[PDB]
Write an enzyme that holds these catalytic residues in place. Structure first.
Site, PDB file in Angstrom:
ATOM      1  CG  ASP A 227      15.708   3.528  13.303  1.00 15.91           C
ATOM      2  OD1 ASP A 227      15.253   2.384  14.713  1.00 15.91           O
ATOM      3  OD2 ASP A 227      14.831   3.340  12.564  1.00 15.91           O
TER       4      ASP A 227
ATOM      5  CD  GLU B 217      10.983   5.883  10.211  1.00 13.29           C
ATOM      6  OE1 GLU B 217      10.167   5.411  10.884  1.00 13.29           O
ATOM      7  OE2 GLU B 217      11.763   5.028   9.587  1.00 13.29           O
TER       8      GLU B 217
ATOM      9  CG  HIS C 127      14.150  -0.260  17.504  1.00 13.56           C
ATOM     10  ND1 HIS C 127      12.806  -0.451  17.297  1.00 13.56           N
ATOM     11  CD2 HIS C 127      14.282   0.754  16.559  1.00 13.56           C
ATOM     12  CE1 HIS C 127      12.417   1.361  16.953  1.00 13.56           C
ATOM     13  NE2 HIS C 127      13.461   1.513  16.336  1.00 13.56           N
TER      14      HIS C 127
HETATM   15  N1  LIG Z   1      12.604   3.857  12.938  1.00 13.41           N
HETATM   16  C1  LIG Z   1      11.750   2.547  12.833  1.00 13.41           C
HETATM   17  N2  LIG Z   1      10.068   2.960  12.510  1.00 13.41           N
HETATM   18  C2  LIG Z   1       9.141   2.503  12.981  1.00 13.41           C
HETATM   19  N3  LIG Z   1       9.346   0.808  13.369  1.00 13.41           N
HETATM   20  C3  LIG Z   1      10.223   0.388  13.779  1.00 13.41           C
HETATM   21  N4  LIG Z   1      10.316  -0.716  14.339  1.00 13.41           N
HETATM   22  C4  LIG Z   1      11.833  -0.684  14.128  1.00 13.41           C
HETATM   23  N5  LIG Z   1      12.717   0.307  14.414  1.00 13.41           N
HETATM   24  C5  LIG Z   1      11.159   0.611  13.469  1.00 13.41           C
HETATM   25 ZN   LIG Z   2      13.152   3.760  14.626  1.00 13.18          ZN
END
Ligand SMILES: Nc1ncnc2[nH]cnc12
Ligand SMILES: [Zn+2]
EC number: 3.5.4.2
Length: 313
Positions: free
Chosen positions: A274, A196, A15
Protein backbone atom coordinates in the site's frame (compact mmCIF):
# COMPACT_ATOMS: atom_id res chain seq x y z
CA UNK A 1 10.69 -14.64 6.33
CA UNK A 2 13.41 -15.45 3.77
CA UNK A 3 11.16 -18.23 2.56
CA UNK A 4 8.35 -15.68 2.29
CA UNK A 5 10.73 -13.27 0.65
CA UNK A 6 11.61 -15.93 -1.89
CA UNK A 7 8.02 -16.39 -3.11
CA UNK A 8 7.31 -14.95 -6.54
CA UNK A 9 4.67 -12.23 -6.07
CA UNK A 10 2.70 -9.50 -7.83
CA UNK A 11 2.01 -6.23 -6.05
CA UNK A 12 -1.35 -4.84 -7.18
CA UNK A 13 -2.09 -2.29 -4.49
CA UNK A 14 0.76 0.19 -4.14
CA UNK A 15 1.03 3.98 -4.25
CA UNK A 16 4.27 5.21 -5.77
CA UNK A 17 3.95 8.36 -3.67
CA UNK A 18 3.64 6.07 -0.62
CA UNK A 19 7.07 4.55 -1.20
CA UNK A 20 8.75 7.87 -0.39
CA UNK A 21 11.31 6.89 2.24
CA UNK A 22 12.25 9.60 4.75
CA UNK A 23 15.84 9.42 3.50
CA UNK A 24 14.81 9.98 -0.11
CA UNK A 25 12.50 12.77 0.94
CA UNK A 26 15.42 14.63 2.56
CA UNK A 27 17.67 13.94 -0.43
CA UNK A 28 15.15 15.25 -2.96
CA UNK A 29 14.52 18.29 -0.72
CA UNK A 30 18.28 18.96 -0.70
CA UNK A 31 18.61 18.57 -4.50
CA UNK A 32 15.57 20.84 -5.02
CA UNK A 33 16.74 23.37 -2.38
CA UNK A 34 13.60 22.94 -0.26
CA UNK A 35 13.52 23.90 3.41
CA UNK A 36 11.64 21.12 5.17
CA UNK A 37 9.36 21.60 8.21
CA UNK A 38 11.15 18.55 9.57
CA UNK A 39 14.38 19.01 11.46
CA UNK A 40 15.75 15.58 10.53
CA UNK A 41 14.83 12.19 9.05
CA UNK A 42 14.42 10.92 12.57
CA UNK A 43 11.81 13.62 13.28
CA UNK A 44 9.89 12.99 10.05
CA UNK A 45 9.88 9.25 10.85
CA UNK A 46 8.38 9.89 14.32
CA UNK A 47 5.49 11.69 12.57
CA UNK A 48 4.44 8.32 11.16
CA UNK A 49 1.83 7.76 13.87
CA UNK A 50 -1.78 7.63 12.72
CA UNK A 51 -5.26 7.37 14.23
CA UNK A 52 -7.04 7.19 10.89
CA UNK A 53 -6.80 7.46 7.10
CA UNK A 54 -6.99 11.26 7.12
CA UNK A 55 -4.13 11.85 9.52
CA UNK A 56 -1.96 9.75 7.21
CA UNK A 57 -3.21 11.46 4.04
CA UNK A 58 -2.36 14.93 5.30
CA UNK A 59 1.23 13.89 5.87
CA UNK A 60 1.34 11.78 2.70
CA UNK A 61 0.32 14.79 0.58
CA UNK A 62 2.78 16.99 2.48
CA UNK A 63 5.64 14.72 1.46
CA UNK A 64 4.82 15.11 -2.24
CA UNK A 65 6.25 18.65 -2.22
CA UNK A 66 9.76 17.31 -2.92
CA UNK A 67 8.59 15.65 -6.14
CA UNK A 68 9.44 18.32 -8.64
CA UNK A 69 11.48 17.07 -11.57
CA UNK A 70 11.40 14.12 -13.93
CA UNK A 71 14.52 12.79 -12.18
CA UNK A 72 12.63 13.02 -8.87
CA UNK A 73 9.84 10.82 -10.21
CA UNK A 74 12.41 8.46 -11.70
CA UNK A 75 14.25 8.15 -8.40
CA UNK A 76 11.03 7.54 -6.53
CA UNK A 77 9.91 4.71 -8.82
CA UNK A 78 13.31 3.19 -9.42
CA UNK A 79 13.92 2.92 -5.65
CA UNK A 80 10.68 0.96 -5.35
CA UNK A 81 11.47 -1.24 -8.33
CA UNK A 82 14.73 -2.19 -6.54
CA UNK A 83 12.81 -3.20 -3.43
CA UNK A 84 10.64 -5.33 -5.72
CA UNK A 85 13.67 -7.10 -7.19
CA UNK A 86 14.95 -7.77 -3.68
CA UNK A 87 11.60 -9.17 -2.54
CA UNK A 88 10.93 -11.09 -5.71
CA UNK A 89 7.91 -9.09 -6.74
CA UNK A 90 7.94 -10.05 -10.41
CA UNK A 91 4.97 -7.95 -11.46
CA UNK A 92 3.69 -4.54 -10.39
CA UNK A 93 0.46 -2.65 -11.07
CA UNK A 94 1.22 0.56 -9.09
CA UNK A 95 -0.93 3.65 -8.47
CA UNK A 96 0.08 7.26 -8.88
CA UNK A 97 -1.95 10.40 -8.06
CA UNK A 98 -1.47 12.86 -10.95
CA UNK A 99 -3.56 15.60 -9.29
CA UNK A 100 -1.23 15.81 -6.30
CA UNK A 101 1.48 16.96 -8.68
CA UNK A 102 -0.39 18.74 -11.46
CA UNK A 103 -2.16 20.89 -8.86
CA UNK A 104 1.29 21.98 -7.62
CA UNK A 105 2.24 23.03 -11.15
CA UNK A 106 4.27 20.00 -12.21
CA UNK A 107 3.48 19.12 -15.83
CA UNK A 108 1.59 15.88 -16.32
CA UNK A 109 4.18 14.87 -18.92
CA UNK A 110 7.03 15.29 -16.39
CA UNK A 111 5.39 13.02 -13.80
CA UNK A 112 4.78 10.31 -16.43
CA UNK A 113 8.21 10.62 -18.05
CA UNK A 114 9.97 9.89 -14.74
CA UNK A 115 7.71 6.98 -13.80
CA UNK A 116 7.68 5.50 -17.31
CA UNK A 117 11.45 5.71 -17.57
CA UNK A 118 11.80 3.73 -14.32
CA UNK A 119 9.20 1.12 -15.33
CA UNK A 120 11.19 0.55 -18.52
CA UNK A 121 14.29 -0.12 -16.47
CA UNK A 122 12.31 -2.33 -14.11
CA UNK A 123 11.30 -4.53 -17.00
CA UNK A 124 14.43 -4.65 -19.17
CA UNK A 125 16.95 -4.85 -16.28
CA UNK A 126 14.97 -6.32 -13.40
CA UNK A 127 12.54 -8.50 -15.38
CA UNK A 128 9.50 -6.84 -13.79
CA UNK A 129 6.25 -6.47 -15.73
CA UNK A 130 4.15 -3.41 -14.97
CA UNK A 131 0.70 -1.98 -15.51
CA UNK A 132 0.54 1.65 -14.41
CA UNK A 133 -2.75 2.69 -12.80
CA UNK A 134 -3.87 6.33 -12.79
CA UNK A 135 -5.71 7.17 -9.56
CA UNK A 136 -8.17 10.03 -9.02
CA UNK A 137 -8.24 11.99 -5.77
CA UNK A 138 -11.73 11.30 -4.47
CA UNK A 139 -11.93 14.23 -2.03
CA UNK A 140 -11.71 16.56 -5.06
CA UNK A 141 -14.52 17.07 -7.58
CA UNK A 142 -15.54 14.79 -10.45
CA UNK A 143 -15.01 17.84 -12.67
CA UNK A 144 -11.38 17.97 -11.54
CA UNK A 145 -11.05 14.23 -12.27
CA UNK A 146 -12.52 14.80 -15.75
CA UNK A 147 -9.87 17.45 -16.39
CA UNK A 148 -7.28 14.90 -15.30
CA UNK A 149 -8.75 12.26 -17.61
CA UNK A 150 -8.50 14.73 -20.51
CA UNK A 151 -4.77 15.09 -19.82
CA UNK A 152 -4.51 11.30 -19.74
CA UNK A 153 -6.18 10.67 -23.13
CA UNK A 154 -3.11 11.22 -25.36
CA UNK A 155 -1.26 9.04 -22.85
CA UNK A 156 -4.00 6.44 -22.39
CA UNK A 157 -1.73 3.59 -23.55
CA UNK A 158 0.55 4.18 -20.55
CA UNK A 159 -2.20 3.10 -18.17
CA UNK A 160 -4.03 -0.21 -17.78
CA UNK A 161 -6.68 1.26 -15.50
CA UNK A 162 -7.95 4.23 -13.55
CA UNK A 163 -8.24 3.91 -9.81
CA UNK A 164 -9.75 5.93 -7.00
CA UNK A 165 -8.08 6.80 -3.69
CA UNK A 166 -7.93 9.47 -0.96
CA UNK A 167 -10.53 10.27 1.75
CA UNK A 168 -13.12 7.48 1.36
CA UNK A 169 -15.87 8.29 3.87
CA UNK A 170 -18.33 10.87 2.56
CA UNK A 171 -16.94 10.60 -0.97
CA UNK A 172 -18.72 7.52 -2.35
CA UNK A 173 -17.76 5.88 -5.68
CA UNK A 174 -21.03 7.24 -7.17
CA UNK A 175 -19.52 10.74 -7.06
CA UNK A 176 -17.19 9.58 -9.82
CA UNK A 177 -19.47 7.42 -11.94
CA UNK A 178 -19.45 9.74 -14.97
CA UNK A 179 -15.67 9.99 -15.29
CA UNK A 180 -15.28 6.26 -14.73
CA UNK A 181 -17.90 5.67 -17.41
CA UNK A 182 -15.90 7.89 -19.75
CA UNK A 183 -12.62 6.25 -18.83
CA UNK A 184 -14.04 2.83 -19.71
CA UNK A 185 -15.49 4.23 -22.93
CA UNK A 186 -11.94 5.45 -23.75
CA UNK A 187 -10.49 1.98 -23.16
CA UNK A 188 -9.52 2.08 -19.49
CA UNK A 189 -10.08 -0.77 -17.06
CA UNK A 190 -11.17 0.25 -13.57
CA UNK A 191 -10.32 -0.40 -9.93
CA UNK A 192 -11.20 1.45 -6.75
CA UNK A 193 -10.57 1.82 -3.05
CA UNK A 194 -13.66 0.57 -1.25
CA UNK A 195 -14.43 -0.51 2.30
CA UNK A 196 -11.17 0.62 3.88
CA UNK A 197 -12.97 3.10 6.14
CA UNK A 198 -16.05 3.27 3.95
CA UNK A 199 -19.07 0.99 4.43
CA UNK A 200 -19.95 -2.23 2.53
CA UNK A 201 -22.34 -0.11 0.45
CA UNK A 202 -19.38 1.76 -1.13
CA UNK A 203 -18.06 -1.62 -2.24
CA UNK A 204 -21.33 -2.47 -3.96
CA UNK A 205 -21.07 0.92 -5.70
CA UNK A 206 -17.51 0.27 -6.90
CA UNK A 207 -18.67 -3.11 -8.17
CA UNK A 208 -21.82 -1.98 -9.89
CA UNK A 209 -21.39 1.73 -10.66
CA UNK A 210 -17.65 1.95 -11.34
CA UNK A 211 -17.53 -1.66 -12.58
CA UNK A 212 -14.09 -2.26 -11.12
CA UNK A 213 -12.01 -5.34 -11.95
CA UNK A 214 -10.87 -5.53 -8.32
CA UNK A 215 -11.59 -4.07 -4.91
CA UNK A 216 -8.77 -2.21 -3.19
CA UNK A 217 -8.72 -2.97 0.54
CA UNK A 218 -12.29 -4.21 0.72
CA UNK A 219 -11.91 -5.56 4.26
CA UNK A 220 -15.21 -4.09 5.51
CA UNK A 221 -16.93 -6.50 3.14
CA UNK A 222 -16.69 -8.79 6.11
CA UNK A 223 -19.70 -7.08 7.68
CA UNK A 224 -21.89 -7.99 4.73
CA UNK A 225 -22.70 -11.67 4.10
CA UNK A 226 -24.56 -11.16 0.84
CA UNK A 227 -21.47 -9.31 -0.41
CA UNK A 228 -19.19 -11.99 0.92
CA UNK A 229 -21.14 -14.61 -1.01
CA UNK A 230 -20.83 -12.48 -4.14
CA UNK A 231 -17.06 -11.99 -3.79
CA UNK A 232 -16.54 -15.70 -3.24
CA UNK A 233 -18.79 -16.51 -6.20
CA UNK A 234 -17.39 -14.06 -8.73
CA UNK A 235 -13.79 -14.48 -7.54
CA UNK A 236 -13.42 -10.71 -7.60
CA UNK A 237 -9.92 -10.00 -6.28
CA UNK A 238 -9.28 -8.01 -3.09
CA UNK A 239 -6.04 -6.07 -2.69
CA UNK A 240 -5.67 -6.31 1.08
CA UNK A 241 -3.01 -4.31 2.92
CA UNK A 242 -2.20 -5.75 6.39
CA UNK A 243 0.18 -3.11 7.84
CA UNK A 244 -1.82 -0.26 6.36
CA UNK A 245 -4.99 -1.47 8.12
CA UNK A 246 -3.02 -1.89 11.35
CA UNK A 247 -1.34 1.54 11.10
CA UNK A 248 -4.53 3.36 10.13
CA UNK A 249 -6.42 1.65 12.99
CA UNK A 250 -8.81 -0.26 10.74
CA UNK A 251 -7.96 -3.17 13.00
CA UNK A 252 -6.88 -2.48 16.57
CA UNK A 253 -4.32 -5.24 16.18
CA UNK A 254 -2.86 -7.55 13.52
CA UNK A 255 -4.21 -10.53 15.45
CA UNK A 256 -7.68 -9.21 14.61
CA UNK A 257 -7.15 -9.04 10.84
CA UNK A 258 -9.67 -10.98 8.82
CA UNK A 259 -7.61 -11.64 5.68
CA UNK A 260 -6.91 -15.28 6.52
CA UNK A 261 -10.59 -15.77 7.41
CA UNK A 262 -11.55 -14.42 3.99
CA UNK A 263 -8.88 -16.62 2.38
CA UNK A 264 -10.30 -19.75 3.98
CA UNK A 265 -13.85 -18.75 3.00
CA UNK A 266 -12.68 -18.52 -0.64
CA UNK A 267 -12.44 -14.76 -1.16
CA UNK A 268 -9.69 -14.19 -3.72
CA UNK A 269 -7.63 -11.94 -1.48
CA UNK A 270 -4.07 -10.78 -2.10
CA UNK A 271 -1.25 -9.28 -0.01
CA UNK A 272 0.04 -5.75 -0.71
CA UNK A 273 2.10 -3.05 1.03
CA UNK A 274 0.00 0.00 0.00
CA UNK A 275 2.14 2.85 1.34
CA UNK A 276 5.32 1.00 2.49
CA UNK A 277 7.34 4.07 3.55
CA UNK A 278 4.54 5.13 5.86
CA UNK A 279 3.48 1.78 7.24
CA UNK A 280 6.99 0.45 7.78
CA UNK A 281 7.07 -2.52 5.47
CA UNK A 282 7.00 -3.73 1.90
CA UNK A 283 5.09 -6.74 0.60
CA UNK A 284 7.34 -9.40 2.23
CA UNK A 285 6.92 -7.58 5.53
CA UNK A 286 3.19 -7.81 5.11
CA UNK A 287 3.26 -11.61 4.58
CA UNK A 288 5.52 -11.81 7.61
CA UNK A 289 3.08 -9.91 9.81
CA UNK A 290 0.40 -12.45 8.85
CA UNK A 291 2.61 -15.35 9.87
CA UNK A 292 3.68 -13.70 13.11
CA UNK A 293 0.31 -12.35 14.30
CA UNK A 294 -2.11 -14.83 12.63
CA UNK A 295 0.03 -17.97 12.35
CA UNK A 296 -0.40 -18.00 8.59
CA UNK A 297 0.97 -21.21 7.06
CA UNK A 298 3.31 -21.73 4.10
CA UNK A 299 0.23 -23.32 2.64
CA UNK A 300 -1.71 -20.09 2.86
CA UNK A 301 1.39 -18.16 1.87
CA UNK A 302 1.57 -19.94 -1.46
CA UNK A 303 -2.13 -19.42 -2.14
CA UNK A 304 -2.02 -15.65 -1.44
CA UNK A 305 1.02 -15.19 -3.69
CA UNK A 306 -0.73 -17.17 -6.41
CA UNK A 307 -3.93 -15.14 -6.19
CA UNK A 308 -1.84 -12.06 -6.80
CA UNK A 309 -0.45 -13.66 -9.98
CA UNK A 310 -3.93 -14.77 -11.01
CA UNK A 311 -5.40 -11.29 -10.37
CA UNK A 312 -3.07 -9.43 -12.73
CA UNK A 313 -4.83 -7.30 -15.38
N1 LIG B 1 -4.73 3.23 1.14
C1 LIG B 1 -5.10 4.46 0.76
N2 LIG B 1 -6.38 4.83 0.95
C2 LIG B 1 -6.76 6.06 0.59
N3 LIG B 1 -6.03 7.03 0.05
C3 LIG B 1 -4.76 6.63 -0.13
N4 LIG B 1 -3.74 7.37 -0.68
C4 LIG B 1 -2.64 6.54 -0.65
N5 LIG B 1 -2.88 5.35 -0.13
C5 LIG B 1 -4.22 5.40 0.19
ZN1 LIG C 1 -4.19 2.23 -0.97
Amino acid sequence: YEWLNALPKAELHLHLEGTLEPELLFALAERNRIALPWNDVETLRKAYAFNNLQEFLDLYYAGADVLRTEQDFYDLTWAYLQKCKAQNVVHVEPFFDPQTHTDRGIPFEVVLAGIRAALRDGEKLLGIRHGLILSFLRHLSEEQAQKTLDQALPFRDAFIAVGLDSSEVGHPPSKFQRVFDRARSEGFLTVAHAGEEGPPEYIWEALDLLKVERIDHGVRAFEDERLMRRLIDEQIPLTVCPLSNTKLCVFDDMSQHTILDMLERGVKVTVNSDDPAYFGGYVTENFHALQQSLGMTEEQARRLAQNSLDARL
